[model samples]
Target: YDEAITRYFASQYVRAREGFQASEAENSFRLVSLLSSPKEQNRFAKWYAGNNPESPQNIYHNMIATVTIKSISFISKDLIQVRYYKTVRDFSEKETISHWVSILNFSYVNAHISTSDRLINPLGFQVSEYRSDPEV
Candidate 1:
């Protein structure tokens, strides 16, 4: 899990940007729910941690701090890209580990989007089959 998070953080931003692009192209609404409000942010953090249930393979739970909209760009009429960052906790609680963990969380969320066709917003679209990390 640590290794996955490490690699994910290293490349998440690029991945997230791509995911946003794909979703936008499909005319999907993609918005980064910000952590500007302390109460709201706290709620999000709890929700994330709870939803990402802990497991033997994932003993260390993840905590989300903030999510920011990085950018939104257009590729065509049917395509657009949205980029964002999410701050998270590093399992160890060490300064360096925490910093890196936060970095990876942001990137992982971003990068994870591109490889799968899961819509962040599932309102109007028909459900499509895809793979996801079981831990998530």
Candidate 2:
């Protein structure tokens, strides 16, 4: 479980700038969605879509993100909370670092089941609540 969550953060939080191709970005979103709940998936789906007028893609196209997990703990038998650091480098080579937290809700899915969802989310982990703010 711990290793799975760590891997999830590593992939979901890291962003490539110029070298990132469209096909890879599309697959990235699919993986992220598999690890997240409906609400969390929607948040990322919008970023991938970028059809709206006010979207991060419009401004952060040249940005690269690096993430480090600071802590992880259980909120309940089925919920986990994580604190992490996200550093982003902009096109100008300026870095902005911020502390962020996320709440993950785990739903146990029987590994014995041979379903498509089970194939992608073998660990049965999903992010139920996700919020981030700059620390003072």
Task: Name the best candidate (by lDDT).
Answer: 2
Tens digits of per-residue lDDT for model 2, 19-136: 1333355555666677667786787667556686444454446675566677676677776666777776776889887786666555643334247756656665565555454454
Clashing pairs in 1: 9-104, 12-107, 15-110, 15-111, 16-110, 16-111, 21-81, 25-78, 25-79
Error of 1 at 117 (Å): 20
Model 1: per-residue lDDT, tens digit, 94-132? 422111111112212222233224444222121111111
Distance from true location, Cα of 91 in model 1, Å: 7.6
Error of 2 at 121 (Å): 2.9
TM-score of 2: 0.63
Task: Give the Å error, residue 58, model 2.
Answer: 3.8
* Candidate 2 accuracy as lDDT: 0.57
